[PDB]
Design a protein around this ligand. Sequence first.
Ligand code: FAD
Ligand code: URC
Ligand code: FES
Ligand code: FES
Length: 1295
Amino acid sequence: ADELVFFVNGKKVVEKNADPETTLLVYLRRKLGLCGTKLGCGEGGCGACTVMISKYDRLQNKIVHFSVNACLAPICSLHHVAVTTVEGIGNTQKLHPVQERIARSHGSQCGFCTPGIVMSMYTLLRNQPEPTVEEIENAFQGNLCRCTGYRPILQGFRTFAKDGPSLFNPEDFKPLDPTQEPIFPPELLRLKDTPQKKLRFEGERVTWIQASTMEELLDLKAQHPDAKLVVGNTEIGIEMKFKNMLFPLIVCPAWIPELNSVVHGPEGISFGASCPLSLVESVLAEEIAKLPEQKTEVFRGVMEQLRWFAGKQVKSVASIGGNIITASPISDLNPVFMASGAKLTLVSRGTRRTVRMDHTFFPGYRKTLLRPEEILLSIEIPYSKEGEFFSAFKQASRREADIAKVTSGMRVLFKPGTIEVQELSLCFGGMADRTISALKTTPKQLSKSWNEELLQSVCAGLAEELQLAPDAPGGMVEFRRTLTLSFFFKFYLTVLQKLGRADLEDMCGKLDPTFASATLLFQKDPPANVQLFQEVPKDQSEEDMVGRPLPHLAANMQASGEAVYCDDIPRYENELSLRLVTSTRAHAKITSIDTSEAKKVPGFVCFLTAEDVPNSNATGLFNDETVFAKDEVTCVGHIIGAVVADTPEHAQRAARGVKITYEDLPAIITIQDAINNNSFYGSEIKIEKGDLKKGFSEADNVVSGELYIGGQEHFYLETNCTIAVPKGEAGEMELFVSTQNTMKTQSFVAKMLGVPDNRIVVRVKRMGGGFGGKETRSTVVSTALALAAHKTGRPVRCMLDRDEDMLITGGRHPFLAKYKVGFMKTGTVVALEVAHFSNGGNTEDLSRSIMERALFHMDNAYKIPNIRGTGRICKTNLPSNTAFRGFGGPQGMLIAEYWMSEVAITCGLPAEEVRRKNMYKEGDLTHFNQKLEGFTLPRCWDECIASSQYLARKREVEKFNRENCWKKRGLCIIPTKFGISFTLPFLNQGGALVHVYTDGSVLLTHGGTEMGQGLHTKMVQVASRALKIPTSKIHISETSTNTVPNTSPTAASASADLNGQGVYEACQTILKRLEPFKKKKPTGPWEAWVMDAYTSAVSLSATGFYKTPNLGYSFETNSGNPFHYFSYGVACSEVEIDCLTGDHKNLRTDIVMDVGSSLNPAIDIGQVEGAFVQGLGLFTMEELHYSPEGSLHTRGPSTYKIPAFGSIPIEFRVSLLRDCPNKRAIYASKAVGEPPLFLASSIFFAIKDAIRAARAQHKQLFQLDSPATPEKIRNACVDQFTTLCVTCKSWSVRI
Ligand SMILES: Cc1cc2nc3c(=O)[nH]c(=O)nc-3n(C[C@H](O)[C@H](O)[C@H](O)COP(=O)(O)OP(=O)(O)OC[C@H]3O[C@@H](n4cnc5c(N)ncnc54)[C@H](O)[C@@H]3O)c2cc1C
Ligand SMILES: O=c1[nH]c(=O)c2[nH]c(=O)[nH]c2[nH]1
Ligand code: FES
Ligand code: FES
């Protein structure tokens, strides 16, 4: 047959013409209109596309449920399954407990990840209605969230756990009733009786065969060796989508019973090749639990690899054979299967052979010794024998859901009753183009005794055998080499212990108890979290929600997937799709463009270039950017043109048929390239105070050095998206955009078209994250699309894929700092000179303002009487860098804390003492001459140091450190000051419009956009207090250029301060109009006043506006206030590093934050944790790599590792400072968005201390660049392993 039949949320689907290249995500969203399930990445990393599958399993004879990534599930694999999406478990009329709890617990901010997390938690509960805390965290390994910091999500779902004033009340949560879950489609139960027959699906390019029997599979492969096997599609899905490979014949064997069997034999367990590795997990788990330790050494090796193997979504469908035959050089399983010589059985039509995975199974890049007509039937995973021990290792950039840098299986077999080596196997991933054995090192150790000589021998061997070319793909050559020695050392120590417990301690020797911690398998304690905030007064009306923890107004709809993001908006019947075509060279003239292949693609409409621009090709904030490339491209990812087509699939294919010819031009990539070439955005910026010559002469000590700070991708989970709708009259156009900047979107589209602004309407409902990345760079999509719509007279839409978004839109500015600080022996700093260099990319954008903010913050919290800061903004052939939460502040303040760390240690005084005595006091002037009034930072400091019990913890850390050789702890307390207001004064303005309808209901709008920070929630809270009506009677629908004009972007943490005042004033005007009707009827209700004013013909509409008074700094005169006030905060953080791998635990973080009198402590704490965890990523995890030719390598969650559920401080405590009203801002609040982010430097400097301790154990003022990744941490822990590894064309360059 050829009809595809499955169910979605209980509703039957018959697809008569199923295309093999159609993903379930595309089918749900575009074909069925169910847009709760989101696209976040397309590569199986983010889990925003998570849905549940149910089916009758023919083999275990029961209904089963598991989770999948819809983005990677082919609909042609889903015959006779039942899909459940977020829409199928509940809605706002009747939320499922999962939805209720994530929403009420403040677990949904921007809302974009909330459906996929719901669906992960939902699936766990359908499998296990009483899970453990462990099982709950484990459920979300495949789910990323960029806003919340994860804490509230876990805290809310802890209420489900078997073994489980305040922000929420878990006792109002309605109970789970599993009888109320949706029926498994009866029809699917009826069909379980019928045998499965072979299916054939035919699309544009691809034919899919679903083989029902092994005979059919082997026949097909005999007659057509070229048929591509697809099982989980977790590899092929990626090959097709990201490496533009096309397999025109696919066969899916997933149904075949022989490929799904589990047979327990004498030598081990044999898994069918199509067994999902989730089934491998459950089988080996049960086996490990019931069998003796002695014979489950290999099994435990596999389970250890599978712990750190993606998450539940991938492992549900990913097959064991899948991973083997893919032959990735970084398989986590193949090293283990090889090290254990696992038995693989192969078959074709009328042949069958068995072999042991050794080095010959993997001959070359991505090849196996399988013949083209042959398929893998099964892998036996062996029982271990007496005197046989195994370890598995993996080090990445992040523990969870990451791809190996180095990964290994290691096996030793001892001659019986001995410590003499019979067999040894050391196999590695990530060290060559294939899984390799250390064949030249292993044989030398035969019959040797397991001792310090074998340990040194093997290490010398691995050092010589596992060479890396400096060009070697992936880089990190020293770290990768070190890792192989380090893993073997752990194996060595582990074997000693295992010998020990076999009663041969007398022969091999005891383990020094300070080495024991080396061999321990990763374990985390259960989390503990604390949230402290201030109750509102006794007096305050229960209808006055200002200061109360009101949940985000859209939380319920976000958990239900009813909240509408831009691409969720239904398509017009005549709507077209746009796809950007981008430069693949950093600097080069465009010689020619050939659209000849692009036109052959069915659906192609046109290719837009500079020539099609009606009016101006000059755009960007400083008018120095092209809408489309004209003559030369100036970065890899420079936008050249845009394809327009009927569908996105057709737009993408057509876009591949635009062939461009280039002629290269001198490229300027790095900060150094830029310095050498004097290529800069404008002149040097400078702040200078006191006498620098004097200060340095007086200083007992002077320290000099450099610090590099890597950039950051925003990874808003909703990428950039615009729909442009042309109106056909007078140049009128309406845009629906995920942007923080409606005004610039409007202006840029207007100018590009050559029509006045009054013709262009930009509408923003909400964004799934912004973080500064949608302050300006959203417009490169908006303009291309506006043009397509103008040209065609048709609606046009573009949502960027994650790879596109990451390449085109740029990030946080990398900084290079050169510093010279002079101080006394007491720790007091008397002179500071710091040169700052940013890499700004190929347009000015916000770069100059960012450098200004960095300089405004080079003091951090410290009075420095003699100080000189300069910044220079490099102009390079890279994507233009832009605003990222902090806007140069974090960069500024890290440099300050870096040299401050070096002062502390040069003086041999405690860090905290040196910091405290250097701290400004109330009434002081900054280096830019602004008075610090209401300086709460000391209170923040004294509270945090006391509540975190900093001094006692110091002692515990010191103790751990001298009792452990290969693990070390560090502890650091970091303050911050953050200035509040746009560096550009006139941007400190906002507007509101309010209407009161005759039913008494209020429709409010202001210039701010909602991106998950809870701005609308806050403004509703404000309006409610202002008008003295319940929040229930006030609504905000959207943000729009034709309701409030000339709005500043939603940025600089300012948007609640500005819009809050606007809203307030709009409400004051209304109240003034209602006054006389209130006097006549003081008790009669709101509705009566309103209807009275209407029937007396009094206006019930009003604008409101606010400007921040008394702002304006001058760099000429070093006078005037840049800031309206300052945010202040302090964080104490503890880490434990692994000295042999570079991995670390974030053990505990304590934050005290001054948000004034919080408008909303639930949102404010959320913003603290969110900001903090972004900082955490910036300073420890998140790293962007570029080729020396300036091509971003790092384009997806696979290779760009943001903080995961497992990344957050195990113990995470946030307190909002009590009794600190900030009268100048709306209802005595303070901004909160950005200031907390820098406090994650506490973890950077805590890692610093741990490294220092590791160095003393095995050069002072050692270098630690940001981000402090595994690579840097491990490389800085110099030891006998690094020293034997350490000593051109290369994969990447430091930009
Ligand atoms: C988000 C994400 C995270 C990942 N993390 C990891 C990780 O941590 N470690 C890791 O090692 N891998 C990882 N992978 C890779 C992938 O998940 C595994 O390699 C997986 O086992 C592939 O199995 P599959 O069934 O999806 O293979 P498919 O993609 O269906 O097929 C893969 C290849 O195997 C072939 N094939 C499948 N079965 C057979 C058979 N019986 N005989 C012959 N050929 C066959 C196919 O033709 C194809 O060439 C990750 C992938 C994703 C998307
Ligand atoms: O002073 C600022 N100006 C901005 O334009 C901006 N954008 C941002 O994210 N933070 C800041 N800060
Ligand atoms: S969209 Fe499917 S995993 Fe990210
Ligand atoms: S709230 Fe999770 S990505 Fe925004």
